[PDB]
Amino acid sequence: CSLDNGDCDQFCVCSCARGYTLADNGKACIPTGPYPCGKQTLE
C-alpha cells in the first residue's frame, strides 16, 4: 500500500467506510445512499 495507496479509493487490499461498498474492480468505493459520509452535498 506504500505506493499510490495500493491504487485504492479509501482504506488499503482496498476497502471503504460505513455507507460504502467496494466496487467490482476492488479499488473504487460505491455510495449506498444519497448522503454518504464524507461527501459535500449537491442540490
Binding site: 467506510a17 448522503y35 459520509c37
Partner: protein
C-alpha cells in the same frame, strides 16, 4: 475563523453548532452519524445547558434546513483536565435521529493505522465554525471555513508555552493572519483523501488567535478511534 472564507451551500455539511440557554452559539461539533455528535470535552463546561443545531449557515436568519436536537447522553473522556487540556474530546448522543439532507451529512471516520500514514501525512486539512473573526472581536454570523497546513510537531513544541501531547497535533500558520478562534472550539478539522473527507481533528486551543509565532492546537482523532467506537455503542 480568522481569515478564510464563507462555506458555500453543501460545502461544510458535517458542521454542528452547540447553543446555550440564550440560544447563542458557543462551540462547534462534527456529525458522525444520525445519533452522534463529536465535540471537545472543554466545551461541556462553558454552559449550564445546551442543544445542538444542524444545517445552519447564517445565525441571524432562519433558513430552510435548520433543525434543533436535544442531547440525551454526554460522554466525556474521563482523563480530560483543564490543567493540561489533554484528552480534549467528548461524544454526544441525541434524543432523536438527524435527517440527512442538503447541508447535513456525516464526516467519515478512518481506520487507525491507515489514518496515521495516509491522512496525517497530507499537506493540509479543513477547519470550520462560527467563531470570532478576530482575537477580540465578535462571532461570525455566517459559517466559515479555512485550509490549514499541518505543522511539524517539534516546531510546534518550540513555539508553545504549554505542553503538546501525543493526543494533540498542530496546524495553521506562523505569521499569516489565518487561524481558528474562540467560538470554533469543538468543531471539525477534516482531511480530504481522493474525494472523501475524513474527520482528523477537533478544534481545541491556541494562545490568542492568528498570533505570530503561534499555531492552532487540535485533538488528534486517530488516537481516540477506539474510544469513539466504544462510546458510540453505548
Amino acid at each position: 475563523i480568522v481569515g478564510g472564507q464563507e462555506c458555500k451551500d453543501g460545502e461544510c455539511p458535517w458542521q454542528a453548532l452547540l447553543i446555550n440557554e440564550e440560544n447563542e452559539g458557543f462551540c462547534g461539533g462534527t456529525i458522525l452519524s444520525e445519533f452522534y455528535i463529536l465535540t471537545a470535552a472543554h466545551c461541556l463546561y462553558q454552559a449550564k445547558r445546551f442543544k445542538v443545531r444542524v444545517g445552519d449557515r447564517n445565525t441571524e436568519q432562519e433558513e430552510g434546513g435548520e433543525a434543533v436536537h436535544e442531547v440525551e447522553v454526554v460522554i466525556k473522556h474521563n482523563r480530560f483536565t483543564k490543567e493540561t487540556y489533554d484528552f480534549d474530546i467528548a461524544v454526544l448522543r441525541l434524543k432523536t435521529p438527524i435527517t440527512f439532507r442538503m447541508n447535513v451529512a456525516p464526516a467519515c471516520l478512518p481506520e487507525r493505522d491507515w489514518a496515521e500514514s495516509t491522512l496525517m501525512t497530507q499537506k493540509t486539512g479543513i477547519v470550520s465554525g462560527f467563531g470570532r473573526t478576530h482575537e477580540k472581536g465578535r462571532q461570525s454570523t455566517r459559517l466559515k471555513m479555512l485550509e490549514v497546513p499541518y505543522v511539524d510537531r517539534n516546531s510546534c513544541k518550540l513555539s508553545s508555552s504549554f505542553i503538546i501531547t501525543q493526543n494533540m497535533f498542530c496546524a495553521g500558520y506562523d505569521t499569516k493572519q489565518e487561524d481558528a478562534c474562540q467560538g470554533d472550539s469543538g468543531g471539525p478539522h477534516v482531511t480530504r483523501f481522493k474525494d472523501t473527507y475524513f474527520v482528523t481533528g477537533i478544534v481545541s486551543w491556541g494562545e490568542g488567535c492568528a498570533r505570530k509565532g503561534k499555531y492552532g492546537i487540535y485533538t488528534k482523532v486517530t488516537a481516540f478511534l477506539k474510544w469513539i467506537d466504544r462510546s458510540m455503542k453505548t
